[PDB]
């Protein structure tokens, strides 16, 4: 379950982005929204799991960087502070997804937009669930790449391209 | 009013207003593969999550039902007297 | 009122088909095929890394101390 909170927003992003043609605007909206709704429900449970019972959860998958004295894993720790952050992150992400069906209805590129939304949720989960500072940096940079992708969503407007340079480089 | 766009441009994300008429069938198929993929990562979690404190017997903790470390504990604790 | 999906993948118009330029044969069968065959072989490659060797000795030194429990 714990490693499934991490995985679901990522899969919905990949379907909406690389397979938007097959699912269409409706199918992309449904898969993107449903995956983050499911993740939100699994995260409310994990708050009862970890915080209310004082049971931290550790899961390591494989090593990322292996050297002398340097062993950084693709590992995740769930503690009281992790589940505390996950609730606003996933409640707001779920609702903004549902909101965005009405707000971005007339826009031509909905699959690309909803893909960037799920990509941001995945990266924000990586930032708060990591075992180490270097995997937290992956979410930090990832959220930055996703904010550049979403500030500059309308690439035709030059103002947007200046403001995304500001976000990326600052 | 919809923007005029070129119809020879191929995009993996669909392009300008792309919804296929098979959208529902394809979306159903992508849902199953998502469900199948997320089923494998779940079984990985169950066998590889690590806890240093087990939950209370009567205290709400739905992980009790699928994680092996807890299931090994609760079955062992169900042997006494 | 969503539009039909459109576009020409590889620039092939809806009439004709993709014409094989020549590179495709070796690159799909030889270049990529070699990498999958290399990938499946790499699974059965024995592990001759320094760490797998150094971990096992390191455990036998810390087992000689209270730091690591010994199965004996």
């Amino acid at each position: 379950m714990y490693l499934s909170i991490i995985i679901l927003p990522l899969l919905g992003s990949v379907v909406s982005g690389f397979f938007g043609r097959k699912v269409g605007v409706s199918g992309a909206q449904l898969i993107t929204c449903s995956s983050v709704i499911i993740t939100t429900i699994l995260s409310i449970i994990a708050f009862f799991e970890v915080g209310f019972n004082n049971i931290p959860v550790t899961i390591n998958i494989f090593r990322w960087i292996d050297s002398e004295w340097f062993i950084i894993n693709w590992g995740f720790q769930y503690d009281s502070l992790t589940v505390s952050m996950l609730i606003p992150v996933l409640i707001i992400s779920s609702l903004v997804h549902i909101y965005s069906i009405s707000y971005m209805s007339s826009d031509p590129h909905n699959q690309r937009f909803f893909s960037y939304l799920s990509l941001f949720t995945f990266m924000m989960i990586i930032l708060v669930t990591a075992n180490n500072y270097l995997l937290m940096f992956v979410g930090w940079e990832g959220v930055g790449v996703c904010s550049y992708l979403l500030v500059s969503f309308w690439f035709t407007r030059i103002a947007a391209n200046q403001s995304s340079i500001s976000a990326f480089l600052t | 009013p919809k923007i005029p766009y070129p119809k020879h441009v191929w995009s993996p994300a669909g392009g300008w207003y792309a919804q296929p008429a098979n959208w529902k069938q394809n979306t159903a198929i992508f849902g199953l593969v998502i469900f199948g993929i997320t089923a494998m990562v779940w079984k990985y979690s169950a066998e590889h999550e690590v806890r240093h404190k087990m939950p209370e017997p009567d205290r709400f903790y739905p992980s009790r039902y699928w994680v092996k470390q807890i299931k090994d504990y609760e079955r062992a604790q169900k042997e006494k007297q | 009122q969503y539009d039909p999906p459109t576009g020409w993948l590889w620039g092939v118009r809806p009439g004709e088909k993709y014409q094989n330029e020549g590179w495709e044969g070796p690159f799909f069968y030889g270049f990529w095929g070699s990498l999958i065959v290399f990938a499946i072989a790499y699974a059965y490659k024995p592990d001759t890394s320094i760490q797998t060797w150094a971990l096992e000795e390191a455990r036998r030194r810390l087992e000689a101390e209270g730091i690591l429990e010994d199965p004996n």
Partner: peptide, 19 residues
């Protein structure tokens, strides 16, 4: 409404089969 249908694609199967 239109009837143009999009097939799942070869990229769909190479990714699924690859996984």
């Amino acid at each position: 409404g239109h009837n143009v249908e999009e097939p799942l694609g070869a990229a769909f199967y190479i990714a699924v089969g690859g996984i």
